[PDB]
Amino acid sequence: PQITLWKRPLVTIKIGGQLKEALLDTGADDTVLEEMSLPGRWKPKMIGGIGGFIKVRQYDQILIEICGHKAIGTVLVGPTPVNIIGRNLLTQIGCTLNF
Amino acid sequence: PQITLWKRPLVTIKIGGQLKEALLDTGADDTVLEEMSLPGRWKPKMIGGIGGFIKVRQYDQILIEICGHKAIGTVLVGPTPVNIIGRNLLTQIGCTLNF
Numbered sequence A, B: 001p002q003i004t005l006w007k008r009p010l011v012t013i014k015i016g017g018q019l020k021e022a023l024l025d026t027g028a029d030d031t032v033l034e035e036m037s038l039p040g041r042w043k044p045k046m047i048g049g050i051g052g053f054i055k056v057r058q059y060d061q062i063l064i065e066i067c068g069h070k071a072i073g074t075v076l077v078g079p080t081p082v083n084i085i086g087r088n089l090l091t092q093i094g095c096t097l098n099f
């Protein structure tokens, strides 16, 4: 798809057998999802943004389907108000910005 | 340009006679710049992100050059660690996401 930016670029993701909406986010280094249960071990991690820093759980080698495109990557889980697809996964699906 | 996402999508902007680097950010509703002096009246505004909220100053009808492309828009100024070009201006320069 070619996605204009008049609205928030939300797409459908499938992760852990569940369907969610997520923002395609060129300003995010990492992928950060709201609280959900993922199978596996994890490491604590801190991420920063506007207004400060949150603690998240890091999971590696997680399968995600982003608009029908499969990617495997590190996914962070924690108290974010919106599901974020960051650059670690955007490069895997061949996502570019064009103007 | 076509911009891949292996690194942070930083571009040159010119604003108020000054040269800066700014992130092209599809996850930002608004454009948010580090502290600088802009001529004109302003309105207080709050914006939110990961880790909380911040107070910013809002300026309207500000001329910005993003990579040689001129746009006029609302620019927010406040304590952000990185200059953000958000969707209000990305639509004006015809910027799309593609995969």
Ligand SMILES: CC(C)[C@H](NC(=O)[C@H](C)NC(=O)OCc1ccccc1)C(=O)N[C@@H](Cc1ccccc1)[C@@H](O)[C@H](O)[C@H](Cc1ccccc1)NC(=O)[C@@H](NC(=O)[C@H](C)NC(=O)OCc1ccccc1)C(C)C
Residues within 6 Å of the ligand: A025, A026, A027, A028, A029, A030, A032, A046, A047, A048, A049, A050, A051, A081, A082, A084, B025, B026, B027, B028, B029, B030, B031, B032, B046, B047, B048, B049, B050, B080, B081, B082, B084, B086
């Ligand atoms: C998502 C995070 C992982 C991301 N942070 C990172 O990538 C950081 C650098 N990573 C990181 O921490 O790496 C490890 C590390 C460790 C030690 C030291 C340094 C780093 C981030 O917050 N990035 C933001 C920019 C930023 C980065 C660093 C520092 C400061 C700011 C936006 O690009 C990012 O796109 C977010 C994503 C997002 C969207 C929606 C909700 C929450 C988060 N958008 C935003 O924060 C934008 N807000 C919005 O667009 C909101 C949604 N609209 C809004 O506020 O409208 C008015 C409103 C008023 C009242 C109620 C509701 C709305 C903002 C830039 C304009």
